[PDB]
Amino acid sequence: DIVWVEESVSAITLYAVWLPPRAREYFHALVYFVCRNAAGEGRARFAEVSVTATELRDFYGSADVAVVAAARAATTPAASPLEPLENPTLWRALYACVLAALERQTGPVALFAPLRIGSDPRTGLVVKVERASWGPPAAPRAALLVAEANIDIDPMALAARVAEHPDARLAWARLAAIRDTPQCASAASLTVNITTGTALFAREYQTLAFPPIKKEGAFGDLVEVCEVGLRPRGHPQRVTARVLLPRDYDYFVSAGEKFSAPALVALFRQWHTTVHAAPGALAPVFAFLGPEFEVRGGPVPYFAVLGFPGWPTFTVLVRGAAAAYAALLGAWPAVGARVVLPPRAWPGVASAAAGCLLPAVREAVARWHPATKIIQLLDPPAAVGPVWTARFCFPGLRAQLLAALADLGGSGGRTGLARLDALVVAAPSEPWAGAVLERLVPDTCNACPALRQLLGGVMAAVCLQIEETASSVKFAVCGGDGGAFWGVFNVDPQDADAASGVIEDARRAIETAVGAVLRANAVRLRHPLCLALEGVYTHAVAWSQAGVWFWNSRDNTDHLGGFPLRGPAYTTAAGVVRDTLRRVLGLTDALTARGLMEDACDRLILDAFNKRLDAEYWSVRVSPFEASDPLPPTAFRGGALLDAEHYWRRVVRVCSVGVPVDLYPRPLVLPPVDCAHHLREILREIELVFTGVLAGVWGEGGKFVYPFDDKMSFLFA
Amino acid sequence: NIGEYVKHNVTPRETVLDGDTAKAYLRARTYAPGALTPAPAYCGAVDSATKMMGRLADAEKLVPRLLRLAATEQQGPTPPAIALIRNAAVQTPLPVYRISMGQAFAALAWDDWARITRDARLAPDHGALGRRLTDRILDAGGQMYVNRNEIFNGALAITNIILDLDIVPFRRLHEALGHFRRGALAAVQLLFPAARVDPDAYPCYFFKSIGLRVCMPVPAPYVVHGSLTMRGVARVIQQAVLLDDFVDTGVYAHGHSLRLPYFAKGRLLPVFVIPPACKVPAFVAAHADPRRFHFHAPPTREIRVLHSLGGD
């Protein structure tokens, strides 16, 4: 006898993790559901799931992780620490393993979706969840979060943390320092305002361990303190879980630039200590993940709640964040590619996908190498025109093929595949899905290189069929990769209706041929291929592998690719490169082209003199992977601004020494910026572009060099 | 010939800044307009070497958010970096001055130039008029007001050709200065081709303490950038003068100082050599404006910066 209710799970959270008596290979997890009925009144549910050592290792990617390690990692949240940055992989693996075990041992769960939930009154835990037949869900309600905390880390502590790891992002140094001496969070200041649809909650704190200076609202109108007695099976006694059940909201929302992670860690740490100071209950897990918990950081901002409080929070686009939360069970971006398969399960699937392919593409996968030429490209520098040039894309093809080949190798445990398939189907219509896949596919292929190999081989097959059909549909593929490729036609450059007809016929022919080939290789697709014509052009110039510029001499539209865009200065440089290429190719020898190119460079440098003191303008973004010149401890005194540093470091050169513009308050006061250095880099890029254009349109071996030392260096030095 | 020596020994290098860019260049590469103008009293940072190092330390405590004195140049709606001066209304670029006591340094936004030039200001043909007008003429702050040496800022443009000459009756001296004037303006017409220098009306300001200082405006529309360019201008004017009837180039360098007119070690006082075609009270009065004295004083559309005179 199990009692069933029509509910909807607003959030799935991790409450307890332990190991039952005389257990050495399997642990147990007590998982807290924030649920909501049709009326939206919140209720609290619990489930208990079991994970074996093999599942944990499979979700971890290696055999290093031990069950005893997860046990001590989850007992250690007495909430004063910040444990998940001791081993972020451990916590991602544990979260993904618990969610997989929950879907496997209790039912197909779905956030914000109608479910029928059945619990065992004797034990109190939820015993089985199924997909509800009918019922409109409650509307996911948001609350607006503003949290700002002043935390006093000694700058030399950050200096030492960065000195141990020279490429450490300073948000990670901030969090590592807070982990070293947690009292910094207790004796810090904090202002928090939480606005729901009902009332306003607000607290202002001088020492976050002392009573508030400013109060506005009660703490019992945001949430509800619930005590639920459970009887986890195989364990001696009844245990009580004390939880916070958010009234009339399901997730927080935090702004982008104002977001601070230690602020919310300190706030939730004080909430945890206040709520769980009363004895006679269980202390939840206190775990948070984000880009800021890795030394090298992480590109996409987020921070995922694993434990207390029990509900999401979005560092934002709000609709897309909610959709990505719902469609992925909230494990993304927290778990990474683990939201599809455990990494240790990717080899076999790849093998299976290889085994099901036709022998030719089998060998293509077997031999695949990144640099291997596949089709008859244009061998830059080259120029085409006046012709009819077209650009084509298979929008989202890599994600499509990954989903298809995963379902092909499914003979190697598939709810992750269903999530990936729904993402693939959703990409043609809502862009959050495509944005997710842009990060998900590379991460998946980083999980296993055999996947790179398989997917590149199938891409090679696609390229081969594109060339084959191009031969027969009046098309010569001049460049591209296979999911996006450009080429030229043999049609009269003067008849435009005939042109458009030929573009359309070629598009249909190529789409049909690629679809047929993928189908013959048994690679079935979740939504049928669409071949998008990105644009029609009349001239094209290629100077590098990905450096290409397209011009349409009849409506004056361009497209530029391969030009770095690592600052506003490079944006302006791209703009002038496209303007000057418009003029140069409208000039239809090399002498006049060089005259126009040097005029463009001179005008660029004058306009750059008009911005000779703009730090943000001349700052370039350096990634955690390029070398970066350090700076004296002065940047280490930035304070809260150090936390909004997880991937990119904007750096200027002043008079030459680097300055992380973003690490200091405003207004900045600096020596004059070394505009000579920045303009030299920018002009090196521009000379690559111009040299390619000259060698393509006129075959001149004389490269474009713009003399800077002579002629317009005096303005700065 | 002077034409041949210019044609064979200087490599003119000029860049024509236009409109907004030229105005920005003048304002960011030449002293602020208020720095020139006489003021009721001096605002600045004036002290010996040691105490100046201390003040610089305090400023470098205040900015994180001994060539650095000349380097401390800036912009600002908010006050500049040099505002070390402790006054908000400062404008950069500033004059920076060397003083003897012990060596002292001043970074000044304003000064009482009236009191500096007041003891040496006045209320036939040209030569007789010049001879007659010429005949008719401690702490850091005080010893500032006794002598001052302008420090060359390699980061600012040059608007005045300023020659230090180290060379007798006074008749010979004055006649030689007139011939010097003709030779120097021949040189200036050669070096500065786009400008209409009238050889007998273009101001040369002569200051005598034998030691002379000659001061000419750079002809419109040029400014001169670079220590080497000014050294070349000096070499050309020396050659032009030595190839006309008569009977120092190391001063142009970043950080090098040059004694200003109306200051002692003998005090430099005007020696009026009126141009043959002037139309003369203004010439006499202008012998007292500091904008004829400093390398980097603001000039009085297109601006052709001459930034190189190459040559082995």
Curated annotation (Swiss-Prot), chain A:
Keywords per UniProt: DNA replication, Host nucleus
InterPro entries named in the record: HSV_HEPA
GO cellular component term, pick one: host cell nucleus
Effect of A337V: In strain: Nonneuroinvasive mutant HF10
A Pfam family per the record: Herpes_HEPA
Outcome of substituting N446D: In strain: Nonneuroinvasive mutant HF10
GO BP term (any one): bidirectional double-stranded viral DNA replication
Disulfide bonds: none
Subcellular location as annotated: Host nucleus
Protein family membership: Belongs to the herpesviridae HEPA family.
SUBUNIT field: Associates with the primase and the helicase to form the helicase-primase complex. Interacts with the origin-binding protein. Interacts with the polymerase catalytic subunit.
Known role: Component of the helicase/primase complex. Unwinds the DNA at the replication forks and generates single-stranded DNA for both leading and lagging strand synthesis. The primase synthesizes short RNA primers on the lagging strand that the polymerase presumably elongates using dNTPs. The primase-associated factor has no known catalytic activity in the complex and may serve to facilitate the formation of the replisome by directly interacting with the origin-binding protein and the polymerase.
The protein's name in its UniProt record: DNA helicase/primase complex-associated protein
Lineage summary: Viruses, Duplodnaviria, Heunggongvirae, Peploviricota, Herviviricetes
Curated annotation (Swiss-Prot), chain B:
Compartment(s) where it occurs, according to its Swiss-Prot or TrEMBL record: Host nucleus
Domain of life (superkingdom): Viruses
Disulfide bond sites: none
Recorded family membership: Belongs to the herpesviridae DNA primase family.
Protein name, UniProt field: DNA primase
Record text on subunit structure and interactions: Associates with the helicase and the primase-associated factor to form the helicase-primase factor.
Record-annotated site: Essential for primase activity: D164, D166
Function: Essential component of the helicase/primase complex. Unwinds the DNA at the replication forks and generates single-stranded DNA for both leading and lagging strand synthesis. The primase initiates primer synthesis and thereby produces large amount of short RNA primers on the lagging strand that the polymerase elongates using dNTPs.
